[PDB]
Amino acid sequence: DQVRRCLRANLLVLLTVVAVVAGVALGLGVSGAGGALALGPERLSAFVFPGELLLRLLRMIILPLVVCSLIGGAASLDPGALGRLGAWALLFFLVTTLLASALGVGLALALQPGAASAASKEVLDSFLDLARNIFPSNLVSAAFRSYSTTYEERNITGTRVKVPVGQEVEGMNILGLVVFAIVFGVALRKLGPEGELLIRFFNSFNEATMVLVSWIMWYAPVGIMFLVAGKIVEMEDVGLLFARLGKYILCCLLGHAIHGLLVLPLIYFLFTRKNPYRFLWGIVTPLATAFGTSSSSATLPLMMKCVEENNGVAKHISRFILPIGATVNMDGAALFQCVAAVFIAQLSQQSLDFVKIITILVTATASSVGAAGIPAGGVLTLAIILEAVNLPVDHISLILAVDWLVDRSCTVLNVEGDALGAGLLQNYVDRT
Amino acid sequence: DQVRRCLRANLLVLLTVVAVVAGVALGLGVSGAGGALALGPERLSAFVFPGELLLRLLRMIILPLVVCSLIGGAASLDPGALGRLGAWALLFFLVTTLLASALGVGLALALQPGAASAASKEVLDSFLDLARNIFPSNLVSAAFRSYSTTYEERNITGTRVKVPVGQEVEGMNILGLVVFAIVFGVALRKLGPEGELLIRFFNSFNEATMVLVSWIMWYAPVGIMFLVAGKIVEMEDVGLLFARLGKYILCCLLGHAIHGLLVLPLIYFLFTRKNPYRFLWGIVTPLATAFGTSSSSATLPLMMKCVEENNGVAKHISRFILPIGATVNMDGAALFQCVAAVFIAQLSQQSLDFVKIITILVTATASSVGAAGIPAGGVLTLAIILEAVNLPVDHISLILAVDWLVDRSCTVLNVEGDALGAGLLQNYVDRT
Amino acid sequence: DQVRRCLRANLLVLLTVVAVVAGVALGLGVSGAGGALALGPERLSAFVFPGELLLRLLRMIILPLVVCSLIGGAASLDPGALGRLGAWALLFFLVTTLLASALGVGLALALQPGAASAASKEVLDSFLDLARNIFPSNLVSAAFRSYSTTYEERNITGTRVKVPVGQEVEGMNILGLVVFAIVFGVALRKLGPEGELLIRFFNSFNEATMVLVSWIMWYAPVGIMFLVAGKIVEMEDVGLLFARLGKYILCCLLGHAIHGLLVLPLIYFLFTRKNPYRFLWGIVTPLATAFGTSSSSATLPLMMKCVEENNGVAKHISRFILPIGATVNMDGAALFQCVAAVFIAQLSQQSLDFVKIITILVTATASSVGAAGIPAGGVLTLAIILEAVNLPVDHISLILAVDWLVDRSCTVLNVEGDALGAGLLQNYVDRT
Ligand SMILES: NC(=O)CC[C@H](N)C(=O)O
Ligand SMILES: NC(=O)CC[C@H](N)C(=O)O
Ligand SMILES: NC(=O)CC[C@H](N)C(=O)O
User: So where does Na(+) 1 get bound (chains A, B, C)?
Assistant: First the structure.
């Protein structure tokens, strides 16, 4: 009857949380067998192994996906700078996403989820190391290794000269590779119709790897349950992690509720001079079903069906920015990246490092225009920024473990983002 | 007269055995000058050098050839799962090639050619190291280096903890790269007509490198004679190597004669319930000329000219599987890879290592559908598996030195393979 | 009036010498503040840093530009071996460029500019190391690292055995990569119309990177002034460098005047048996304006407007070789590469090493057919050979600092090259 309708539509996002609550069970079973009742680090890695094989070939495809889905994207941008009264919305989308992700980290590293009872050093003139990494030395070595400065001593006229020498270290720099792929993407657009084939090569190449990143997602529930099992063994506690998680769902949703209800409505009232609470009261029902379906793509047509008569928006802007803002202005993911990538930074206690805090915030504004629409789409697109800023990505497991609630909490602020942007632009254009 | 006909048609396979019997001559000449009558390892490498330059740029082209001849191959496979009574032949071709290569190694490492008078250690849970190498971490580092586990000691609560740490070591993993290229090859087929260009890119790219691997083969006779000369110098013996070779031609041909005359005719009689010796007695003459021309491509049309009336095969299956089985069901090469790559393993005494024995047997079943048709075509395609399972490939020289007999011995079992498969399928379809 | 005409046409080659004379000014300002009045090597590198960022992403684009502008070049060569009386001009262009670059180094390392008051070791059987580097082991490791032999000791029957072992060291080998790209370029031409797309891919790919190497050149004047400032600090002298430069402009222009006035006119009189000084006296005015505009592309149409009636050249060869020789026979750059890359070799005192002196001379004959037409075009194309023969490329700064005179001195010998080749071919064809 309806056991074929709902169960087969969102099977995978259902099955991926079936996996982790069963993955923790045999994780509890071996800690019910008790710690390393199985043999030590030479044999236990063989039983955490097919959890690595989700994570290992996940890093394989992000070399095509981050560089070939982005050239074909950035070649089809700027359609003649299409809106004199349209590009201000695109500038609105960027500043409401920076300000989204500004309090993203700025709440979490102020609130410290992860380092509660947990309780070499790098100079902040490693900003040039970030800039030397943006523009890579050559491309083929930039697909697997990246630049980094280590300090050695000279011991000449002073026992501590502390000279920075730069040795290229492993792990790719997709942070320094999407900057190539953007600046290659404008290049072959500017060249024009003679090099159209290179677009038609590349934007078919990502759909040749988006079609196999679907195949990786079907491996994920078998894969996830072996890196949540082999993640609670070496931690040995279960009461500890549900306080590790149990503060993280707080700072996400509080990070949404602070953002969603106040700070973009303050952006509303500073330009609209009307009531945002009279504004969104008409559009509660798409924001109701966006929490239900967890898809701004699915609630895309229902927005114009409601906001056009429940609020006085124009005709042509209902289809002009709101199809854009459903897959471009994604403030909901931009919190969810920005508060997770600093959360995993507090799991392993990497570094405070303000130079990383901007590049954990620029990329989180750049994956925010990335994955979209489908539920649990941000899990892939924050898996590329955890490889960008060299975090240990293997802690993705516990933070898509609770994705079933938090992505539904971010989908509603996602769909809210262009909606208030729609009402803000109509008062800028009808006022004339 | 006929000095232009025969001599110019198979010139290269003639000239490559002219080269090695002349290459051993000045190899005997410097050992007739006596050992290192020339200067030592700093000067003798300069005179073995243009033998390395066959072998060095041989490894260059196997990065395009193994990954671009295989996507364009695997995109044109499964034409709608073309045969309800046809795909059983393709399943027949695989199981008669595994069972071919099963006794491939299983004869040779039971018979030990190479380690007769010759007379760190790795754990057999390096199977995960093989599986961690199948699915690579990223593609660009998978074109030149591969994963491997080394054991270091921890010396904490036990002086021998033996922790496996994994450092990526040099030498590419085409074993882990053709698995990408297959699973990319099904990807852009499944995507359909929108990404047809990526096929039309790639299957023109291999013909842009198959046309220069012809040019490498013309360098080979100049090249071979300087790595058979500089291979018998450091071994210093000539009576030793002709016992090294003189057992290898045995186990190949015995490996064919055990396979060809008994074990697939036992596959015949278990399904046909007729006489295979009454079967192949009609088709001795193509099997006669297949030994002569050493080309299943050349003896491809002569098979239907004989087997269709000398035996009661059907009309449509004479052109349905037998054109397939001439370049797909190649059991003759699949012995010849599988008994050489363990033979070279016994020259350098690498390792017994059952984990390698399956991946010396999976790939030998995968290059068996690879190179075809032309004589001495398996020499290239076993040069890619000697780089797969990290054998020293420079001992290819002495085993194409005697290729002139053994490939003619494997061509006849090659052409035999689909022929008995043709007779087996007709008794499965005419019986109805 | 004319402040918009001249100033906006050659702005960049004006602005790049504005930059260096202002870049030396604050370079003099910090040495007017006196040496390391700023903090030491941990802080001064942060203020030489945006000079590195010209040089760093300069090395980025020379992986596409040297391999994708060269396949699309070498696929469109040999149009049916187009001239029975035309290819002798192309053979003339090569031998007048070797003989140009023969005295290129051969003047400079005989005259020693750079090592005047400046006042491990590698064996000359590192020629095989050059040949082992021409033909690379695999392509993807040839885009960032290259082969090199180091000698270790064996200490067995002699305390100094000096065995050469070969470890691959950093820095790419575009010397060994353009040899692939040529021999790939003939491959897909020979394959014909079926692989036309790979040409149409690649010759659109360089115009997708020639269009961003324009964007690098606009960064260059901001970029240059921070690596001439941070180059005179560690040298601390200003009177020293203007003797370092002040001999270099000598050996260039003397290298042109020896070449231009005598040695190709001796090639003239050995075949023409007429007066070259009666020859070029008619064409002083294009050679006048070639010094002025510093562009053989701009003085391309003015050559046929003068040399066709001021000298008795034919009709059809005026448009047959002289459009070729304006962008192929470039002897002016071939001095300017060949005397700079040995000049920078005498700045850092790298090595005398006759094996390098031919590969500093083969590539300088190969970039001579490279960049063209525009003034200061050789600065890019000698930046790729300084990465070829592993020179420190960061001394490009002081030798485009004085490019404004020397390229105008080489443009006139550039345009002279095919002009005398035009007069030489007409006396070979009208004589019949
Ligand atoms: N990561 C997310 O959940 C993004 C928000 C919403 N689900 C979307 O796909 O647009
Ligand atoms: N390597 C081989 O000789 C293969 C068998 C046969 N010569 C063929 O080309 O099909
Ligand atoms: N590097 C150079 O100046 C080359 C000579 C001349 N300017 C040209 O572009 O052809």
Answer: 325, 329, 414, 418
